[PDB]
């Protein structure tokens, strides 16, 4: 049986502040801009519709020296940082982005259509932009949290799912890594593999994967390292109702309608346009301090391995500024050829923390337990090379003067004495 | 005279955790996709607008063997599981659905008509989609809940209701089965029998009955096994205003308007489109622990016949993702013929429960009482073949370690000691 | 190590009221109207989208003589005024502004395009208005607060960013000055330098810098002078969805879409129209009394150098009234020629304060600490020439009879005794 | 120095109820309908957009005779009524108006312009109607309250503001009189003198003054008789965005835009159409009892000169019913000629009160005080002939049987004993 870190981890009156400097990110909000020839990234893809998985590296309390550590034996005892308070600073003004696609697959507007026009042509795709669902999360664990998304599954011992057929979907687990896409209104799937025409979702999501955090799994993990704090805030509505183009795969059962003279049965592949509606200072989940006093799972903000993952999505600040640059300010009349528009979005974060020094006495039982949990714990006391995270090193940003910082100042106060 | 189960069921300090594994369901949102020849279902009809009637099977405490059961005589006593808490965990992103009908019956948009064009021709139907009323409901009871819808009644000893005439309506009661439709803004009725043209409601309902919980009935049942807890959160508004095509049954009394020259009097058969407006985290009725400490009726969450019904409707997460497949990825110019769009909707559920062991002493009085109430309960201590339920067996999912689980861990806490 | 003024500034029972007469301001909301030949401002640009940085000049309490100052030695001690409560009276009726541009750079409406028309021509700009993002703020500090915005950045030791190219951005800090524009929903940036065509945002901002208070920097400053108090309320949504005109600088990766025959790929330079939705006396942040009992930073509203800054933005009273004057009223038929339309906007402030007398004992340690904090504080007890602020002098507006003023009256109540 | 009435006004245990009979008003909502020839008003102007200034007369307590006035000396003392509870009953259903102008000055809709048509003709005005900003107020002063609007100022010593120019504005204080217009989302101004074309506002305001309570002045008045209790509930948003017609006085500085070939530069005089949004029972500020237990200013609901002023504006019930009257019911075909549409609105108020009988001993000190306050107070104990109030006489409406009236029932109950 799995048991609470309070059963094997002693706390200590020692607290330290730690804050990341200002973290900025700027680039194009749709696709990346790589060199004209090389395939090396020039200007990243920084959208407001992107996860932020921060891997927060903490100094090893065992290297560090401590004064209140005089009734502590480094022979048989060890040290972890237990996270006590988190503040995820956000800067930039609130506002909304808006993604589109030069050739969106949209047939007609089936909200209040004018009439019925004969069978269409080939390529009825049109340029259309829209504003996605608004989300605001913040998961804190000492393992990176996972995501779920719908992806293409492998068929059974039967027929061959030849081209054009509908491939069986499969609900896949995945690790959330910096720069992944959140669901925008089209659900959480994998667009590249479930949509061949690559045309019916704006460019920012069309060739990628909108992931949704596996809350139900993460929450149900025995040890519960993947997250021991969260906050969700999603909300959306139907701006528009449309028809898709191209031949319907599963045709309509004729005993559901009466045969209407004249017609090859209009499209039924309907799809709506979301809308995040409105972003308001008061809706905001960020910029406030969170005290994870008691954790949701067994692990009680114990940052094994001296690490921390702060995951964050946030579409309230999503605005894309456009920059226009002229070919030559030598003209005196407006001509479009003379200017080039670019699109730029820039993200701004600030992470603060306050951790508590804790001690673990390595006895027969505890060692066993830690062992079945995670061996590295023990092993490192004497891996994710495949995942990409926004790296945050606070090995040199630790303080003990809580007073010098807003979050510390709060903490002192809020913790009372 | 009906009596509270506190009068004849003894409670004990024994609480077990029960949980279902991830339930998933993936199907077309509007209609089922059966094999091309066969009439066996290949892909189901999973939609956001459906009920979820879980039949929760529980292990029979009488077979199970227990330690605190020492001051318990199995000769004279029996055992029932009392439900103490429920938690309906809901996977996937909140999103919204959109339903439509290729040949919908929509004469013209009477919100702000342009003019008055003379008597139209035949078949002026059209492709029109729209977002249904938003609803979120959950009923827990140890018997299946009943619903009410408007159906076709049988006429009195008088004239023959020949074709064309309006049949009289009748309020019917019916049990809620997994898969039925909730009222979508069109009322709760039976569209197959009450609408011949099968063309004035999107297909997902036009050939179906839209039930609505009979809360008035179920509330009033003398035993109250039907439901001992429930929460409803329904809301909608008028998206558009239309006119129906087809001659009007009941003509307009001429003393209601002045004879306007030029006309056969335009249609006055009006219908509105609903819109459930917005879904949001805070609206959410699920993912939180319920504790049915005291039950609404007499039965205080005693699951007779080791059984439980969790009826659940949820239009918050009703997004249908479309998957486009290509006939041949050999072409390099977009052509609709080369693509097949498909609609799919995946549901994800999690059921969690906490049960109390309760003993009953089969005496002279109790037995006669339980007999009149339900005989089965007695006979079974020494049916629904016609109703279809999502089947959930937790016989092997019971645990006495409440600690290992969020709903249990909560339990323990909240209960106090 | 910085230390709370509570550590070196004694408080006395001495409270004065002070406040500014009616503060009006009236001009054109879009641009300043200077003489026809001279470059001398005739009518200012008073807009509801502007910053209000008030410099409050306070009487120096060392020249003043006091009666309760008999256990005070002016030889070794000095005096500062400590802010206790502010109150920012707003006049005019709630209302909302509207900003356009005769030659807005607005290709087409991509929200639900009709079709696809071939490649346009040159100059497709058109007149367009709109209601900006809605904001309410108010920073109280003893130094002028700072702003953050996106500017043009100097490139590195490499290639020459020739015309055409997209300049690297750089986030700049800057002093908020009366008259600056807040972000309007086009982000916080320098439109003069970052947008050449000077045609893709209303005139009230296309040639200015919209700034956004760097809460994050100020909050974090070690002494906390820049603000010891603040309230934001900003809210906004996407009224429209547009396409820009002109060539695209970062061209769409061809591997993200399928070569649709017939096109030079439509604009992908999308931009949205904000809207600040709706203003409600409920929303009001203003017209109340603020009591800075405990400061956010180290400075507990020590108005060092007998100064105060109240920075304020307010879009909820943002109306521009329009005045129509005739060329001759001798006509009896309407002709546009004969009427001249003007736009005019007027702001009305009222500034209320309540100060507590404080005494500092100039010792060894105290002096050196004040010195490395700010030397001027010591020097002056025996600079912003480049900054423009709405001067507010209250030297002659101090009152000891707090009962005569609402704020006065409240303060006594609220403080209790 | 001013001082609280508590300082010279003694209270007694004497309360008295009062109430005006049902107050009605019916007429035209836009303009007064005088006799055809005469200039006498036949149907007055009753709009939901108007201020309701009541002058509540009151019995002089000194001529009244009292039984508990046995330890009171009519030779040296005197009597005033102190208001204690005000109940502003409102009848009719909630509902909303819509003002219009057949030749409103509306060039084109610049929210989302079609194209760019060249230089328009002359008189492009059109019929437009609209709902105004929603406001709900109620001020209770023993003097009439003041209001503020943007008037036409006199120029200084220099040039002559010839016809065409824009007049310099000037903030004016005016007394609020029954029948005035509340701002309607075009701000507080004087449409007659500031808008020569008298065509760019619906008629109900186009030739009048819309005023806004000078809350800032009133509140700040040393005595505060103007008002001792108030509640405001104003809201509104932008239903559309338009463009005005007629030459632009203050032309756009050319360096704010690039020279667009093909243009005299479209209009840039923009104006928005407000929208009060929604009226709801809960929003309601009326139909509840108000207990001015403590006043805001110095005057504590003391009705000097036996007088009272209830200023109310309410747009929540602003429905205008239309009545159609035929020229001859002898026709059998609908013909517009045969009918006359008319417009009417009617207003239903009910004023209830509760006054407390206070005595004032006329001493040397108190006399000189009262005199400096208001000589009439003293001279009347042994003027607004130019202002127009809804006169309300309660001289005969006083009862001391508080029990007989809801208000009074409430008072007993609320005040406890």
* Residue at token pair 């701000």: D187
User: How far is residue C298's CA from residue C301's CA, in Å, rounded to a whole number?
Assistant: 9
Residue listed under structure tokens 């009488």: B62
* First and final C-alpha spacing in chain A: 36
- The neighbour count for residue C59, using CB atoms within 10 Å, is 18
Compute the distance between CA of residue C188 and CA of residue C132 in angstroms, rounded to an integer: 13
The set of residues, in sequence order, having a beta carbon less than 8 Å from that of C301 and lying 6+ positions away, is C82, C83, C84, C140, C142, C228, C229, C292, C295
Tokens standing for A273? 């346009």
Give the tokens for residue D330.
């002898």
C/D interface, count of CB pairs below 8 Å: 238
3-state secondary structure B24-82: EEEECCCCCEECCCCCCEEECCCCCCECCEEEEECCCCCCCCCCCCCCCCCCCEEEEEE
In chain A, which residues have their Cβ closer than 8 Å to the Cβ of D261? Answer: 333-334
Give the integer Cα–Cα distance in Å for D358 and D373: 18
Question: Going by DSSP bridges, is the β-strand pair B339-361/A390-393 parallel, antiparallel, or unpaired?
Answer: unpaired
Give the Å distances, CA to CA, from C380 to B399, C61, C79, C374: 76, 12, 12, 11
Count of alpha carbons within 13 angstroms of residue B73, beta-carbon side = 5
Q: What angle do CA C136, C137, C142 make, to 5 degrees?
A: 165
Instruction: Please enumerate in sequence order all residues whose Cβ is within 8 A of that of A281, keeping only pairs 6 or more positions apart, or say none.
Output: A94, C232, C233, C234, C235
Going by C-beta distance under 8 Å and a sequence separation of 6 or more, which residues neighbour residue D194? C321, C323, C324, D150, D151, D152, D167, D169
For B395, the token pair is: 């016989």
- Spatial contact of C181 and C49, defined as CB atoms under 8 Å apart: yes
Partners of C236 in the beta sheet?
A279
**How long is chain D?**
417
Q: Single out the residue of D185, D118, B277 nearest to residue C92, CA to CA.
A: D185
The answer to whether D104 and D157 have CB atoms below 8 angstroms apart is no
Torsions phi, psi of B273, nearest 5? -105, 135
The alpha carbon dihedral of B329, B333, B338, B340 has a sign of: positive
CA D231 vs CA B377, C24, D228, D384: distances in Å: 64, 24, 11, 25
Provide the b/e sequence for D104-137 (b: ≥16 CB within 10 Å): bbbbbebbbbeebeeeeeeeebeebebbbbbbbb
User: What would you measure as the largest C-alpha separation in chain B, in angstroms?
Assistant: 92
Q: What is the three-state SS of D224-253?
A: CCCCCCEECCCEEEEEEEEECCCEECCCCC
In chain D, % helix, strand, coil (3-state, to 5) comes to: 10, 35, 50
Residue whose C-alpha is closest to residue A380's, from A308, A307, A309, A305: A305
Q: Which of D110, D196, D236 sits opposite C100 (nearest CB)?
A: D110
Task: Report CA C239 to chain centroid distance, whole Å.
Answer: 24
Q: Angle at CA C299, nearest 5°, toward C294 and C301?
A: 65
Structure tokens at A356: 């508590």
Residues 6+ positions from D275 with CB-CB distance below 8 Å: D130, D131, D133, D185, D236, D237, D238, D239
Angstrom distance (rounded) from CA B335 to CA B323: 16
Q: Note whether C325 contacts D220, CB cutoff 8 Å.
A: no
Find the radius of gyration of the CA atoms of chain C: 26
| Cβ neighbours of residue D215 closer than 8 Å, sequence gap 6 or more | C91, D230, D232
* Three-state secondary-structure class, residue B130: strand
Separation between Cα atoms, residue D76 and residue D366, nearest integer Å = 12
The sign one gets for the Cα dihedral D375, D379, D380, D385 is negative
Question: How far apart, in whole angstroms, are the C-alpha atoms of residue D249 and residue D267?
Answer: 11
Contacts of B272 (CB under 8 A, 6+ apart): B185, B238, B239, B240, B241, B242
Sequence-distant (≥ 6) Cβ neighbours of residue C148 within 8 angstroms: A91, C171, C172, C173, C174, C188, C211, C212, C213, C214, C217
Q: Which residues of C touch D243 (CB under 8 A)?
A: 127, 129
Report whether B85 contacts B353 (CB < 8 A).
Answer: yes
CA dihedral sign, ordered B249, B254, B255, B257: positive
Give the integer Cα–Cα distance in Å for A132 and A319.
12
For residues C127 and D243, give the distance between their C-alpha atoms in angstroms, rounded to a whole number: 9
Fold of C1-417: Polyomavirus Vp1; Chain A (2.60.175)
Which two tokens mark A233? Answer: 């805030």
Contacts of D193 (CB under 8 A, 6+ apart): D151, D152, D167
Helix (H) or strand (E) holding A406: helix A406-415
Chain C neighbors of A123, CB-CB under 8 A: 260-262
List the structure tokens of C332. Answer: 């009896």
d(CA B68, CA A31): 64
Q: How far is CA B283 from CA A312, B279, B346, in A?
A: 22, 7, 21
Taking Cα atoms as reference points, which of B234, B246, B235 lies closest to residue B270?
Answer: B246
- CB of C276 closer than 8 Å to CB of C131: yes
CA distance D248 to D263: 14
Q: Which residues pair with B252 in a beta bridge?
A: none
The rounded distance, in Å, linking the Cα atoms of B389 and A2 is 35
Q: Do D163 and C405 touch (CB under 8 A)?
A: no
Which chain C residues are closer than 8 Å to D163 by Cβ? 325-329
Q: b vs e for B101-119, b when ≥16 Cβ sit within 10 Å of the residue's Cβ?
A: bbbbbbbbbeeeeeeeeee
- Report d(CA A185, CA A315) in Å as an integer: 13
Phi, psi of C194 (to 5 degrees): -95, -20
Task: For chain A, give every domain's residue range.
Answer: 1-417
> A130, C111: Cβ pair inside 8 Å?
yes
Chain B contact for A335 (CB, 8 A cutoff) = no
Query: What is the distance between the alpha carbons of residues D388 and D180, in angstroms, rounded to a whole number?
Result: 10
Q: Which chains touch D (3 or more CB pairs under 8 A)?
A: A, B, C
Could you give phi then psi for residue A272, rounded to 5 degrees? -100, 170
Check: CB of residue C70 under 8 Å from CB of residue C292. Answer: no
Residues with Cβ within 8 Å of residue C69, at least 6 apart in sequence: C12, C79, C357, C359
CB-nearest to B346 from A116, A169, A237 is: A169
Identify whether the C-beta of residue A408 lies closer than 8 Å to the C-beta of residue A86. no
Query: CB contact, 8 Å: C175 with chain D?
Result: no
Three-state SS sequence of D165-212: CCCCEEEEEEECCCCCEECCCCCCEEHHHHECCCCCCCHHHHCCEEEE
Q: Distance between CA atoms of A114 and A117, rounded to whole angstroms?
A: 9
* Residue appearing with tokens 């029979």: B60
Backbone φ and ψ of B248, nearest 5°: -85, 130
Give the integer Cα–Cα distance in Å for C18 and C6: 24
Distance of CA C71 to the CA centre of its chain: 43
* Pairwise CA distance, residues D169 & A301, whole Å: 63
**Per-residue b or e along B33-65, where b marks 16 or more CB atoms closer than 10 Å to that residue's CB:** beeeeeeeeebebbbbbbbbbbbbbbbbbeeee
SS3 B329: coil
* DSSP per position, A37-67: SS-SEEE-B--SSB-EEEEEE---TTTS--S
CB nearest to A248's CB, from B92, B275, B341? B341
- The strand ranges marked E within B76-165 are 77-90, 99-104, 126-130, 134-141, 146-152
Of D199, D176, D183, D178, give the one whose Cα is nearest residue D150: D183
Residue D259 in contact with partner chain C when CB distance is under 8 A: no
Kindly tell me the sign of the dihedral angle through the C-alpha atoms of A146, A151, A154, A156.
positive
Burial class (CB in 10 A: 0-12, 13-18, 19+), A294: exposed
Q: Which residue has the tokens 């097949």?
A: B340
The backbone torsions φ and ψ at residue C294, rounded to the nearest 5 degrees and listed phi first, read -135, 125
The dihedral region occupied by A398, where left means phi > 0, alpha psi between -120 and 50, and beta the remainder, is beta
Tell me the sheet residues that pair with A173: A148
Report the distance separating Cα C264 and Cα C262, nearest Å.
7
Q: In chain B, which residue's Cα lies nearest the Cα of C263?
A: B333
Beta bridge partners of B322: B343
Q: Judge whether C191 and C197 are in contact, CB under 8 Å.
A: no
| Separation between Cα atoms, residue B180 and residue B205, nearest integer Å | 9
> Residues 188 to 247 of B: which have CB under 8 A from any A CB?
197-199, 203, 206-207, 239-240
**Helices within B110-149 (DSSP H only):** none
- With a CB cutoff of 8 Å and minimum separation 6, the contacts of D162 are none
Question: Do B95 and A250 make contact, defined as CB atoms within 8 angstroms?
Answer: no
């Amino acid at each position: 049986a799995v048991v609470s870190t309070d059963e094997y981890v002693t706390r200590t009156n020692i607290y330290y502040h730690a804050g990341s400097s200002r973290l900025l990110a700027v680039g194009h909000p749709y696709y990346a801009i790589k060199k004209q020839d090389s395939n090396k990234i020039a200007v990243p893809k920084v959208s407001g519709l992107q996860y932020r998985v921060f891997r927060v590296k903490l100094p090893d309390p065992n290297k560090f020296g401590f004064p209140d550590t005089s009734f502590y034996d480094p022979a048989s005892q060890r040290l972890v940082w237990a996270c006590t308070g988190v503040e995820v600073g956000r800067g930039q003004p609130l506002g909304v982005g808006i993604s589109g696609h030069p050739l969106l697959n949209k047939l007609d507007d089936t909200e209040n259509s004018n009439k019925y026009v004969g069978n269409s042509g080939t390529d009825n795709r049109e340029c259309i932009s829209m504003d996605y669902k608004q989300t605001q999360l913040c998961l804190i664990g000492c393992r990176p949290p996972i995501g779920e998304h719908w992806g293409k599954g492998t068929p059974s011992n039967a027929n061959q799912v030849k081209a054009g057929e509908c491939p069986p979907l499969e609900l896949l687990n995945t690790v959330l890594q910096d720069g992944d896409m959140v669901d925008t209104g089209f659900g959480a799937m994998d667009f590249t593999t479930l949509q061949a025409n690559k045309s019916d979702v704006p460019l920012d999501i069309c060739s990628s994967i909108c992931k949704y955090p596996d809350y139900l799994k993460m929450v149900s993990e025995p040890y519960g390292d993947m997250l021991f704090f969260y906050l969700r805030r999603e909300q959306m509505f139907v701006r528009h109702l449309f028809n898709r183009a191209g031949t319907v795969g599963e045709t309509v059962p004729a005993d559901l309608y009466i045969k209407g003279t004249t017609g090859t049965l209009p499209s039924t592949s309907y799809f709506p346009t979301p809308s995040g509606s409105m972003v308001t200072s008061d809706a905001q989940i960020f910029n406030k301090p969170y005290w994870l006093q008691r954790a949701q799972g067994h692990n009680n903000g114990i940052c094994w391995s001296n690490q921390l993952f702060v995951t964050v999505v946030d579409t309230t600040r999503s605005t894309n500024m456009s920059v226009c640059s002229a070919v030559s300010s030598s003209d005196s009349t407006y001509k479009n050829d003379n200017f080039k528009e670019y699109l730029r979005h820039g993200e701004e974060y600030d992470l603060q923390f306050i951790f508590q020094l804790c001690k673990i006495t390595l006895t027969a039982d505890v060692m066993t337990y830690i062992h079945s949990m995670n061996p590295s714990i023990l092993e490192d006391w004497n891996p994710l090379k495949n995942y990409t995270f926004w790296e945050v090193d606070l090995k040199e940003k630790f303080s003990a003067d809580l007073d010098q910082f807003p979050l510390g100042r709060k903490f002192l106060l809020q913790a009372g004495l």
